[PDB]
Design a protein around this ligand. Structure first.
Ligand SMILES: C#CCSC[C@H]1CN(Cc2c[nH]c3c(N)ncnc23)C[C@@H]1O
Ligand SMILES: C#CCSC[C@H]1CN(Cc2c[nH]c3c(N)ncnc23)C[C@@H]1O
Ligand SMILES: [N+]
Lengths: 232, 232
C-alpha cells in the first residue's frame, strides 16, 4: 500500500521530451550511471522518466537502474520504430507482444538465431498491460496494432535486412532497445509494456524518414503512454 | 575505510567454476535479477562472484547489479576469448586496454562502425589495474599480452569476420561481454579490468576448439585474476 512507482523509458532525448511535457508536473533531476532520471508525482503515482541513450547496452543499463535504484514496479517504454510490414505506416502505433534480439548469432553451436542459452528467442511483455493498451485504444478509436518487435544494435535501412527480420522472426517493427528493456523486466519480474510509433520503413530512405518524423512519432507514442498511466 | 568490495565476473558458469575453487572460501549464494551472486570474504576484502550468462545484454545487467545492489568498488572480468592475431595462441592471456562493440552499426547516419551518440567507439579499462596486471605478469614470468578486445552478440567463426575486426578496430581478440562490462563500469566510475585466455581462433573450427579448451583457458584466466586480487 505504498505509492505506485512507474518507470517510463525512451531511448533518445527526443522520445522523452513529449513525455515530460505531457505529464506537466515538476520533476527532480537525479543523475546516476550516465543517465538523468526525472522523478515526479502524478495522481498517487511516482513517475521516473529517463532516456537510456541508443541501443541494447544503454537500454539494459538504464532499465536495471530504474528497477534497482528507483524501485519501479512497472516499466512502460515509449518511442519510435521502423516498420517491417505494409500495414504499419508512418505514425501508426504498435504494442509489442513479444520481442527478439535479432542480431544474436550462436549458430556455430546449432542454436537458432536470436537464442542464447539460459534464455529464449522471444521475450514476453505484460499481458495485463497489453490488455489495458488494447482496451484504451478501442475506447479512444485509436488504431493500435500488435506484434513482434525485433531489436538489435544496427539501424536497419535495407530491403535485405527487413526481409530477414520478417522471415526469421515474423517481426512487424524494428528498433534498438525494446527487447533489452523487456528482457531486464522479465529477469526482475517487473511488468513491462513496449509502445512504438512508426518513424520510417527500415529501407534505403529510412534515415531521412526518421529525421523527418521523429518528433511527431515520438509525440504519438508519448500521448498513448500517458493515457495508459492515467488508468494505472 | 570500509572493507573493499570487489566484483568478479565471468560470462559462463564454466568461467567462474575455477574462480570459486581457487579462492577456496565459503560463499553465500544470493539470487537477484536472474543471476546468482556468490558473496565471500578473502583477506580483508568482500568478493562477489557471478556469471552473467552469454552476451551483451546479460553482461550489462549483471555488471549493473553488482554495482548498484552489491556496492562493488572494482570489477574484474575473467573468461575466454577467440584470437584474431597469429601471436595470440590457445591458452595465452590478454588484458584488454580498450574494448569496442563491434556489431554496432549506425552508418546510416554516417557514424563510424562501433559508435553510438553520447558514447565512443572505444571504452577504456583501468590504467592502474592494467599496470598491476603487467607488474604481476612480469614478476611471475607469465606472458601477458595487451590489446583491443572486440565484443558483439555473435560467436565469430569465419575468416571474413575476423579480418573485419582487425581492419576496422585493430582488435586482438573477440568475445561477447567485455565491452559491455567495461562500459557499465565507465558509466558508474568503477575501475574495471578485463582478462581473457584464448580458447579458439575465431575461424571455421572455433566451435570445436572452444568446446575442447574452455575448461583449461577458463582456469588460466581465473588463476591470473586471483593473483591480481591477492595484490589489491
Ligand atoms: C544516430 C541515430 C539514431 S539511431 C535510431 C534510434 C531510433 N530507434 C528506433 C528506430 C526507428 N527506426 C529504426 C530502424 N530503421 N532501425 C532500427 N531502429 C530504428 C532506435 C534508436 O534509438
Ligand atoms: C552457446 C555458446 C557459447 S558462446 C561463446 C561464449 C564464450 N565467450 C568467449 C568467446 C570465445 N571464443 C569466441 C568467438 N570465436 N567469438 C565470440 N566469443 C568468443 C563468449 C560467450 O560467452
Ligand atoms: N548486438
Amino acid at each position: 500500500q505504498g505509492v505506485q512507482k512507474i518507470g517510463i523509458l525512451g531511448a533518445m532525448r527526443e522520445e522523452i521530451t513529449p513525455i515530460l511535457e505531457l505529464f506537466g508536473v515538476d520533476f527532480e533531476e537525479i543523475p546516476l550511471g550516465g543517465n538523468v532520471f526525472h522523478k515526479g508525482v502524478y495522481h498517487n503515482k511516482e513517475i521516473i522518466v529517463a532516456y537510456s541513450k541508443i541501443g541494447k547496452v544503454h537500454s539494459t543499463l538504464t532499465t536495471t537502474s530504474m528497477i534497482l535504484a528507483f524501485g519501479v514496479q512497472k516499466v512502460l517504454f515509449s518511442g519510435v520504430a521502423g516498420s517491417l510490414v505494409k500495414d504499419l505506416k508512418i505514425n501508426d502505433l504498435l504494442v509489442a507482444t513479444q520481442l527478439v534480439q535479432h542480431d544474436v548469432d550462436l549458430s556455430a553451436f546449432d542454436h537458432p538465431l536470436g537464442f542464447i542459452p539460459e534464455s529464449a528467442i522471444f521475450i514476453e511483455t505484460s499481458g495485463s498491460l497489453n490488455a489495458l493498451a488494447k482496451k484504451i485504444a478501442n475506447e479512444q478509436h485509436i488504431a493500435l496494432k500488435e506484434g513482434v518487435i525485433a531489436s538489435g544494435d544496427q539501424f536497419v535501412h535495407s530491403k535485405e535486412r527487413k526481409e530477414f527480420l520478417v522471415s526469421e522472426f515474423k517481426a512487424s517493427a524494428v528498433e534498438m532497445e525494446g527487447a533489452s528493456v523487456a528482457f531486464v523486466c522479465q529477469k526482475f519480474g517487473v511488468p513491462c509494456c513496449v509502445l512504438r510509433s512508426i518513424s520510417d520503413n527500415a529501407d534505403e530512405k529510412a534515415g531521412m524518414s526518421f529525421d523527418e518524423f521523429l518528433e511527431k512519432s515520438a509525440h504519438t507514442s508519448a500521448k498513448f503512454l500517458k493515457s495508459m498511466v492515467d488508468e494505472l
